[PDB]
Amino acid sequence: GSHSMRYFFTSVSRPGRGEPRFIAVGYVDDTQFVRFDSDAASQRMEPRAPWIEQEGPEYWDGETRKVKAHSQTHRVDLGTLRGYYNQSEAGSHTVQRMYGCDVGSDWRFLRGYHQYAYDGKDYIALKEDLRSWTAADMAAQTTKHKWEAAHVAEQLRAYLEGTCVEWLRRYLENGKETLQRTDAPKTHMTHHAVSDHEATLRCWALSFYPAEITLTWQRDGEDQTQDTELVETRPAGDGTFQKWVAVVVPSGQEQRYTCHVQHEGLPKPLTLRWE
């Protein structure tokens, strides 16, 4: 299938004392493979998947240097944006950055992205053509002009369409045993009698990878949305994911309802029904 490499960066200023809390996480698809945490002792980019440990000392020195460069930029930005928004020095603020690249089944470049937020709101983002910027407000507009004059988009494009795609392909190969393995959901259904006339059917999907999945209820062969509940997909903690969907039904009518499961790891969609 298609694949992605994504990096997520968060800095939170500490007005009370010291430098911002800085946390970087790297993903291939839904697999975290590196992290940097300013609160950790190592002060190094650290491995979080076995297949990245194949990389030698030069890799780790380079990623450490570069991710520390990210943290300093974030620190400087927190100061700059505080001024742009005329904010006090007393408050804590947050900067968030995410960027990365998608490749298709053929591992050819598909898309690139780079977005930036201040205090949880869009600040500036690279457009889909990777040639121009979306600035949410007049502060971000100042940044946009600065980045245009310095041709940041062009430099970013060289990474996103070039180096980023080459890294992703390197990782997919090195980690193929897991990265290219699909874990179909382990499914089952539970039954809970809430009262004497209603029952809840819950359709479970467990231990699947990647995270993308569709759970739908049908009644007599038609999609049921009324009286259903779907939880957000959640990590199992072992690299796989979980999800469930439930429907309230009249007692004795359970047989009418079917749960339908779609996942890349499934050759055909699954259908479950309480009988």
């Binding site: 990096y7 970087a24 790297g26 991710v67 930029t73 930005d77 960027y99 600065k146 180096t163 980023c164």
Partner: peptide
């Protein structure tokens, strides 16, 4: 691997 540049805002 992360981007080699990190321009300030």
């Amino acid at each position: 691997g992360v981007w080699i540049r990190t321009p300030t805002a």
